Amino acid sequence: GSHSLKYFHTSVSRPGRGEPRFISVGYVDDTQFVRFDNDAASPRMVPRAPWMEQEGSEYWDRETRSARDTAQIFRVNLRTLRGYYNQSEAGSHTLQWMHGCELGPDGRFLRGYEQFAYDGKDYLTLNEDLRSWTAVDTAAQISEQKSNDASEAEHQRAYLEDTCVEWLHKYLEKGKETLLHLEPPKTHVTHHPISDHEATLRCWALGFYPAEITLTWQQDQDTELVETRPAGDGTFQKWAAVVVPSGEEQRYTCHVQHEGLPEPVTLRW
Amino acid sequence: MIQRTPKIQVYSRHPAENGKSNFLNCYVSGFHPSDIEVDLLKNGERIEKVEHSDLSFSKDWSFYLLYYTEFTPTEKDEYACRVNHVTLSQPKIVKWDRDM
Amino acid sequence: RLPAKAPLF
């Protein structure tokens, strides 16, 4: 199937304390493999997946230099955007960066993205053609014009289409024993009577990888879904519940769709 | 400024069975700004050595974090998650329901 | 790998 290499950066200003906190996490599909956190004496990029621990010191030195450069840039940017919007330094503000590339089933480049946000709202967005930037606020257009002059879209497009793909393949090779392994969910249906008239049927899906899944209730009313949640060991969990009249429990089936299942699964209590 | 209130889920890594080893999880998601307080509770008292995942965020820019620790469920013991955020007027307690 | 730098705004 498809694969992706995604990074998420967060910088939060500390009004009177000098340097902002800067945290960067990297993902391959739904598996985290690296981390950079500037809340340290001598901050470095470290491995967060076991298949990354044979990586050499030249790799970690450069990622550390890139992470430190990025954090310095973000600190200046927090100072400039506070000026753009006429904000006081009494408050703490946030600057986030998400970018990634994804492959298709054929192993070749399918899509890349890159987006910036200030205090949780779209600040600067790389357009789907990877050729131009878009700003929503009037102040953000100041940054857009800086980046249009500097041909920033051309630098970012080169990273996404060539560099990100070449290193995503390298990670898939280094960790394929566990990254290319599909884990189908363990599914069962439970029953808890609310009253004499109605009972609850809850459809469980546990211990599956990747996170993408679909749970549907169907009758031969409204469904309550929960957000897919991490188990803590790299797999995910989810369930879907529906309230049904007592005595008609056998009429309702649960449908489960997941990439690890040879075919979709149907369940009855 | 955008502020988002946190979603909270309390649940076990494995299906709960009295006397068997397991992991207690508190998952906080959909909150903004990132600064948050999370504590796991056992009969109301705070568990000492709880670890948490590295900060990251969803497509809509809201942050999520997993807090976890080892524990042993029994019929009588109650576990909970204590979360405080700027969006909350007071810290929220979510009790652990082994059937959810 | 990480991009080398981020744009100055």
Residue numbers in the entry:
A (entry chain A): 1 to 220, 226 to 274
B (entry chain B): 1 to 100
C (entry chain P): 1 to 9
Could you pull the original sentences from the published paper?
Human leucocyte antigen E (HLA-E) is a non-classical MHC class Ib molecule homologous to H-2 Qa-1 in mice and Mamu-E in rhesus macaques (RM). Whilst VL9 peptide binding and NK cell regulation are ostensibly its primary function, HLA-E, and its rhesus and murine homologues, can present peptides from microbial and autologous sources to CD8+ T cells.
Reflections from multiple isomorphous Mtb44*P9-Phe complex crystals were merged in Xia2, yielding a dataset in the P1 space group to 2.5 Å. Clear electron density was present for the peptide including the substituted P9-Phe side chain. HLA-E structures crystallised in complex with Mtb44 variants encoding P2-Gln or Phe, or P9-Phe, demonstrated minimal conformational repositioning relative to Mtb44 in the PBG. However, these primary anchor mutations did have minor ramifications on complex stability, via the gain (for Phe at position 2) or loss (for the Phe position 9 variant) of three H-bonds. In line with diverse and non-canonical SIVGag epitopes defined by Hansen et al., we provide structural evidence illustrating that the B and F pockets of HLA-E can tolerate a wider range of side chains than previously predicted.
